[PDB]
Amino acid sequence: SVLNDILSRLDPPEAEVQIDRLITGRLQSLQTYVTQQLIRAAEIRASA
């Protein structure tokens, strides 16, 4: 989970593969978060 731990450890090709996965995960998570924020924003906005 610690990005530096990947970069420190692996050869560049493998590092990119692992990092790509981590980014994919974080990105999916960030998008889920943003989606959550957006959907919540709808609920909050309705409230507003």
Add this chain to the structure above:
Amino acid sequence: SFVIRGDEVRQIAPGQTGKIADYNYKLPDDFTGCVIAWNSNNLDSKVG
């Protein structure tokens, strides 16, 4: 075009890690091309 040891052939790859890969011939992580290798041993036979 260049000559390396047969075992060494793994090194010629995009973003690869290795001595030749770092010190002499490095291919980019972006690279596009094909690599071909063969033993010039008969050719590389000198008394010396």
